[PDB]
Amino acid sequence: STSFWYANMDHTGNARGFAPDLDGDFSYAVYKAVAPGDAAGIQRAINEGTGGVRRHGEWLASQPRVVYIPPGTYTISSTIFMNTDTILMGDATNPPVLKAAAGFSGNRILLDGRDPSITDGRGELSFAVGLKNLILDTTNIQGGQEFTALHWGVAQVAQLQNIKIRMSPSVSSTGHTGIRLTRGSTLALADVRLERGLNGIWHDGHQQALYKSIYFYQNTVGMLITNGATISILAPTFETVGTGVLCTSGAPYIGLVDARSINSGVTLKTTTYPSFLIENLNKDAQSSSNVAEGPSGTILNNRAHVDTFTYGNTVGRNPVYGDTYTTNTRPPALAPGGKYPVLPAPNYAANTVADFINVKDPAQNGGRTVLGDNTKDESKVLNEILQLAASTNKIAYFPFGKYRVDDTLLVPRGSRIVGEAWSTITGNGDKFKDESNPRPVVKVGNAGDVGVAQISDMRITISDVMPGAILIQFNMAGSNPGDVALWNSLITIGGTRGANALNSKCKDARNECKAAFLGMHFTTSSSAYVENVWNWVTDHGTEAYDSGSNIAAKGGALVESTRGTWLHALGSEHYWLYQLNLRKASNVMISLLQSETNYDQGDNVQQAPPAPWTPNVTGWGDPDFSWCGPNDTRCRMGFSNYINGGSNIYTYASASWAFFSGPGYQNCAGEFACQNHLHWIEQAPTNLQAFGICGKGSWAALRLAGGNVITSEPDFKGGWNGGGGGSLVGRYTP
Amino acid sequence: STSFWYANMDHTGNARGFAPDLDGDFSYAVYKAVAPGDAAGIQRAINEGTGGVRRHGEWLASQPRVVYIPPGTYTISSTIFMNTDTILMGDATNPPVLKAAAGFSGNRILLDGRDPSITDGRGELSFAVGLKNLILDTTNIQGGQEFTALHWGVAQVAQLQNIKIRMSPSVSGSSTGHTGIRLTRGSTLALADVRLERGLNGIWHDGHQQALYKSIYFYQNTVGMLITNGATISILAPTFETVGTGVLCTSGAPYIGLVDARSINSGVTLKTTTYPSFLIENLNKDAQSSSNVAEGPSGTILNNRAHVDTFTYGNTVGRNPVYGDTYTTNTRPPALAPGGKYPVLPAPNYAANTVADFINVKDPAQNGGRTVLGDNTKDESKVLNEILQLAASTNKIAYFPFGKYRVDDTLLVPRGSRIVGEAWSTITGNGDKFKDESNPRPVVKVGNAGDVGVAQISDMRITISDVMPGAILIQFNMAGSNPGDVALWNSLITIGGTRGANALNSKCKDARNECKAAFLGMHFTTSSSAYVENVWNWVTDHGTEAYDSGSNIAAKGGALVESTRGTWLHALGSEHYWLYQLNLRKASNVMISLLQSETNYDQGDNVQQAPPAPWTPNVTGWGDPDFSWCGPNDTRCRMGFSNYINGGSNIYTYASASWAFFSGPGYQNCAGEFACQNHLHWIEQAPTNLQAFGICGKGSWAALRLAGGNVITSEPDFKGGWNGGGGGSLVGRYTP
């Protein structure tokens, strides 16, 4: 066929992806190839399993399927339905066209990312749906009819990579929609080009999403926002677009940062009362329309350049809801050239198999035997292959598997790592059980390293209760932002097969297991780029087994870097003390942080935090909760944002939700009574620019360093459920 | 070509069904016919509209589609998706077989009743999905694989009529297998007269809010009904033949009602691994059914007895352990239960009747040379009263093709009437004759006072087109010689929410001044004896058909029952009325197998017009609650009742699905889990021989209020039902 690197990798033989924990099935095919032009074969490859048994729906990581679609045109006559943990991989050298037929029958959706096996449309459970190197075409459908090329009501670990959507020109209240997001909890939509139609993206009640580097080309409306909580749009381009962003319902947060307007109309228009920010908008001469318009008329007139304009709930303003214009000079290390760094996930479209090292092939990795079946320690053998590929400038390809490591797996300078449907590194052993000497499972460079370390399509996890485990630690800094990067990956604790020892020790809410020390760590001399990454302590089982979810992992993400750190849609959920900790960091940019308090915590918790952990304030910057009464359990809940000093902190959207008050999915007292403090500033940083700090079920919308509290009600409401339990700090620029 | 009455009705010409208010489309075809054996044509007929435009999804009543499927076998290779306001009508003289192909591709669902155009899996909005005279067959699929013949995550006005589901035999030792009817998220009313053959599960009730399963035949199922979570389950007159386990509840804490059940060579009748509240009344077992009747987490609950009178195991009023067993004996009145069994009747399909036995009300050659339009352009009261008397006096069935028949006076349904519609043909009241609340007048009158005879209506809709404070939408006056002679099946009674009522929708857009749209939805007078099954009594809460929908409506009362003869309510949904949803005013001999209700959404702490306003209560004349016990600004107390029982005798209620959701206009949240309402179920005067079971509630502080003023609090001992007790009430037994 072609020379596309993935299709030419060994998918038979010993170097193929191998799936353990499949109930004795050692013949399951991770890889399937569709015949050229075989449109019916796309759905077949998605669902087909071993010996005629259909694949499991709703599973997260153990039964992955990558469907290779060769170049060509595939005429689609009815909706194609994805499965969880499934990737459609078109040929990157010549992406295939999935074209809707003229006689398209059924629901007017070309591709549905939501697994049909989920009941009651729970998109927040449709994890790990991937689309790569595809062209969606609906030009055979009349532009006046309602149609949706892609329904993206999905959850985390879902990804878009090198996707193009051609639609018919709009006519009419109905028309083509490129990507419609209904119920779901996804993280990032990256590098999608939407051509024509009525709506390029329709955000219909999706909780939150970061839209990174989206190209809106000749859309009647760039993004339609009907309902939803937190919307972050980073580095978009509006070319011949009638209206950039149109929000006709709800009170969400809308973040438009580093936007470009090419011969377009109004950039942000709303008929309701959302809180939005426009930072670094650059308009051309043909874009002569107002920048912002609302129910009362013009909000911001025609300006070719906008610095920092908010219109929403702002701290210190009389009245709270209103306009504010400021100018801020971004640090050149954070924003080279005034623009924050945005990079597409690598697809290696021009690379062939020779540019890679298949870690399992003895002819490629230096004559080493690698299993990836979670039956033995493979740390040393994998540290040697990773150092070999970096020293020879080869990309290290991990076929799918579960690679058990009993010591740190170092990612050395010059590494480019890519996996097959989130190949899994799992830590194990006594070397990660010393909480007095915490140890990284995956270490990205040594202390003081400068170089390239790019990782994509991987998973890191643990197999036992390991109170000293740091799942990934970033030590290396890049020469340019993105040299050290992590794309489209997940870091999980529990919830998946392959961790029996961990699964047996975490079934008691009275003694929550000390599974890990940290999920992610960014050391002081590091400089890392993170996009579409799920940092998740399990709340429920995903792969049909008694999963146990009473886990006390101390901290989710600890950022100590003073060089520069960019977090594009990082989901950090269900850790004990905090989801995001900024400990004396000095150059941090956050385009979206998605977080959720641990479900076992709240008024009816059985073990009050910080227990079972003893906080180390001096050594690791833990919150000690010494301000709460020893039995004030609404006060002793994990923080979503714990900002502790430092400088040059830019956060542009925080989707932090509280749902329950204790084990068993117990309800909270009220809409704003699940938690007291989700967002907490311990020490005021120098040059802090915070926008879109959203919450759910929190009494306070933000806590300031001196102890002052910004209450969610009555004037800092918004976002989740339009304010029915939702917090919104649209502007905090102290 | 057969002699089926519906397929041989005029579907061209002037007597065809006509859909008004379709944005200038006067050629829309309500009726579509599938070619024999054309499986692909079934989906086409569901969605096809005028001139290549697809039909509207989610719509309730204005764009109906009836799909006629001739006899034959239809090999289905992928899931068929229904639409709202859509009926699949197989040939009643020879039902067609919808057979899943051996190479079935997709999610492994043969037929999905839930409209795919609804977003976020909201089955509670999938209204008016009908299936008639069909055989669903999954025998080409191996019995060891998970498969679902019918997904019924739907909402009210959905109906099953003469449906049989054949499945492959389950595999011994296998946890997966065929499921006949799976109910996920949704709010349907009744599933009637379905025969389920083989498979692993005949019915899987997976989180559905509530459902009445009437006259279900479980034939050789490994498990009759599986219940994984849910609130209120009522099973009336089932038959378990060669069934391994009758009812198996492995998750949740629902209410399960088993009444008039038959066991033929079956295993355990009700087994649970959790703590639901169930009732088993009038279970009659054969000799070969030697298993225990009920089994729970602690072991045996009720051992093998061939006959069970009244056994409850749940939250019971007056018990010192609230949760526990109770055995009593009750002699049902012969007028309520002739022969000891409650009356259950299938909805009439007229399978043996031809066109000659019918009167098409629009055909001048059949109705006496009268001009009938059905386009909501003029008053058609006199012309329709004369046709109904004509069809009754000539022993003919009156067939209403679809339309909107405006009436400016009462439309009398006389003695001997049999009325059937085409996808819920609509009678809409109008005029000044329904606007004098001091002289309320029925829109549709079922017989005169003191009449005895047959008056059977099915597949119809009754509504109003303006604000009519004196309008009774349907009033039952006549009694039957046998129960079911006066009956109403598979219908809707709606106020607002649908196109065709511009004057009404324009006057009901202010929550500060709630419009007095109607006096009563349904009325059962003292000398009446009516049978009601699968009927939606609905004051609108939101718009359904893409139009400016005013939903700030104060319709006084939903259903007022004053009858002292027999009255049977099988899955009556009464929703969003102002003062009450169901009022039993000195009624005698009343049987309710399931009542589904919802408090008006504008009511609660943040209400803008405190009840009884804008209504002045008439306690003496009409038995309204005046809410004089509440402080004039205690707004959680001044909320509409779901059950308002006021005196009388011989009242048997077996399931109450009564939900409160919001605290004011705008879908505002409530103060707490049990803080939406104070009283959902209220006894004003204690009746003689009152037998109450399965009184479920949501978000109300009290689970039940007694005549003396004593209150049975939902917490701590009467939790259960909705969300397993997380805000759900459950009075499993109140038998004073």
Numbering used by the authors:
A (entry chain A): 17 to 187, 190 to 752
B (entry chain B): 17 to 752
Paper text:
Here, we investigated the mechanism of endo-type action on laminarin by GH55 endo-β-1,3-glucanase MnLam55A, identified from Microdochium nivale. MnLam55A was identified from extracellular proteins of a phytopathogenic fungus Microdochium nivale, which infects grasses and cereals and causes pink snow mold. NMR analysis of the initial degradation of laminarin revealed that MnLam55A preferentially cleaved the nonreducing terminal β1-3-linkage of the laminarioligosaccharide moiety at the reducing end side of the main chain β1-6-linkage.
The crystal structure of MnLam55A was determined in unliganded form at 2.4 Å resolution. The solved structure contains two molecules of MnLam55A in the asymmetric unit. The entire structure consists of two β-helical domains of 3-solenoid connected by a linker. Each of the domains is composed of 12 coils, which each contains three strands and three loops as observed in GH55 exo-β-1,3-glucosidases. In MnLam55A, the catalytic site and subsite −1 are formed by Glu-140, Gln-172, Ser-203, Trp-552, Asp-557, Glu-591, His-592, Glu-614, and Tyr-617, the aromatic block is formed by Phe-143, Trp-552, and Trp-554, and subsite +1 is formed by Gln-225, Tyr-617, Phe-677, and Phe-678. These residues are spatially conserved well with those of exo-β-1,3-glucosidases. As the plus subsites for the binding of longer oligosaccharides, the aromatic residues suggested in SacteLam55A (Trp-196 at subsite +2 and Tyr-194 at subsite +5) and those on the putative substrate binding groove in PcLam55A (Tyr-135, Phe-199, and Trp-245) are not observed in MnLam55A. On the contrary, MnLam55A has an open cleft, extending from subsite −2 toward the nonreducing part-binding site, to place 3-hydroxy group of the d-glucosyl residue in subsite −2 toward an open space on the cleft in the docking model. The cleft-forming residues of N-domain, Trp-75, Thr-135, and Leu-141 of MnLam55A, are conserved well in other endo-β-1,3-glucanase sequences, which suggests their importance for the formation of minus subsites. The smaller size of C5-L3 in the structure probably allows the localization of C6-L3 appropriately for the formation of the extended cleft and possible subsites.
